[PDB]
């Protein structure tokens, strides 16, 4: 039983590079002397933002095609934070490009890591309230159908496999704890 | 006024392959005739399993090195389901290899996807109870320190950045809901 000593990095090499993906090979030497080679996604400081808009006791969810699984996913609007932007700025911009609304009340609820064994990306969860119409051109290939989901039946979302993705589910439970906080359940 | 119509896959092509990563380029034609090229991880039907062992009103968490972030994450044991194994079989085996316990009571709580845009893999969350000592040989380079976390304070885990990752957080909330169900909160 001793302190958690990080393995030491002996070498890093780019093993594969696609247009959007760049995978590195990492040579490690753990504290017990074992040596091993890991493969990961080249670390980035680029963070993500996820917006959870609430309007008349309803959740504004969107339908978006996902090529990974080749199907339509039902969930919260997600986007990248631009260099220089704050979580609030980015959340308001992305809401505007995908949903067509801006929010006067944006609260930053949590920052989640995403599969740290291979990634180093961060996900910021923002709740959007007091909405107003305003559009920005996003780069979407097709329109994103919106779905209004009652807050009183939020939990029913867990019965829809199109929604059951770790980010959405984490956000749904985090938003509900927050709503519990001020009894808007 | 029209139903969703999935894009047609024009062409799939391996664009990059490392020793654990195979990226594909996908040519897509959306319903509106818009054509686009997306990149993704080669789809697999290989599923994952995540075990949440509970012993004396305590959660058995583990500390594991993540090369993506170069740090030790605090969380639940995760592993692959080998071809042929059921969720129960895989959960019991992986618990034995990583923590040294098998379990008489395994419950399959929920299945989730992780960023379906690029990945297809799904994760099965399994709660393990009624443990018995039994150790199997895994592929870990260093032993995984165990942490007993009181169920009376599970929600305190959200205060630890080492644990705040979408899979862990989802698991935490779903297990607490399951616990709520029978009042062992």
Swiss-Prot record, chains A, B:
Known EC number(s)? 3.6.1.-
Residues where a divalent metal cation binds = 94, 98
**Pfam families the UniProt entry points to:** NUDIX (PF00293)
In this chain the Nudix hydrolase domain maps to 44-171
Q: How is the cofactor bound?
A: Mg(2+). Other divalent cations can also be used.
Q: Which GO terms describe its biological process?
A: nucleoside phosphate metabolic process; ribose phosphate metabolic process
Q: Give the protein's biological function.
A: Active on adenosine(5')triphospho(5')adenosine (Ap3A), ADP-ribose, NADH, adenosine(5')diphospho(5')adenosine (Ap2A).
Keyword tags: Hydrolase, Magnesium, Metal-binding
* Position of sequence motif Nudix box: 79-100
Annotated GO MF terms? ADP-ribose diphosphatase activity; ADP-sugar diphosphatase activity; magnesium ion binding; protein homodimerization activity
GO CC, any one term: cytosol
What is the organism of origin for this protein? Answer: Escherichia coli (strain K12)
Catalysis performed (reactions):
ADP-D-ribose + H2O = D-ribose 5-phosphate + AMP + 2 H(+)
User: How does it associate, per the subunit comment?
Assistant: Homodimer.
Entry's NCBIfam families? PRK11762.1
The protein's name is ADP compounds hydrolase NudE
Species lineage:
Bacteria, Pseudomonadati, Pseudomonadota, Gammaproteobacteria, Enterobacterales
Tell me which residues bind substrate.
Answer: 39, 117
Q: Which cofactor does it need?
A: Mg(2+)
Q: Which family does it belong to?
A: Belongs to the Nudix hydrolase family.
């Amino acid at each position: 039983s001793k302190s958690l000593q990080k393995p030491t990095i002996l070498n890093v090499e780019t093993v594969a590079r696609s247009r959007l993906f760049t995978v590195e090979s990492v040579d490690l030497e753990f504290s017990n002397g074992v040596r091993r080679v890991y493969e990961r996604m080249r670390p980035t400081n680029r963070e993500a933002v996820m917006i959870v808009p609430i309007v008349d006791d309803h959740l504004i969810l969107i339908r978006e095609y996902a090529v990974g699984t080749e199907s339509y996913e039902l969930g919260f609007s997600k986007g990248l934070i631009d260099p220089g932007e704050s979580v609030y700025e980015a959340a308001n911009r992305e809401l505007k490009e995908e949903v067509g609304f801006g929010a006067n009340d944006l609260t930053f609820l949590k920052k989640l890591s995403m599969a740290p064994s291979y990634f180093s990306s961060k996900m910021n969860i923002v709740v959007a309230q007091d909405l107003y119409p305003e559009s920005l051109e996003g780069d979407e290939p097709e329109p994103l159908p919106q779905v209004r989901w009652p807050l009183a039946h939020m939990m029913d979302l867990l019965e829809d496999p199109d929604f059951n993705e770790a980010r959405n589910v984490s956000a749904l439970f985090l938003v509900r704890e927050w709503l519990k906080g001020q009894g808007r359940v």
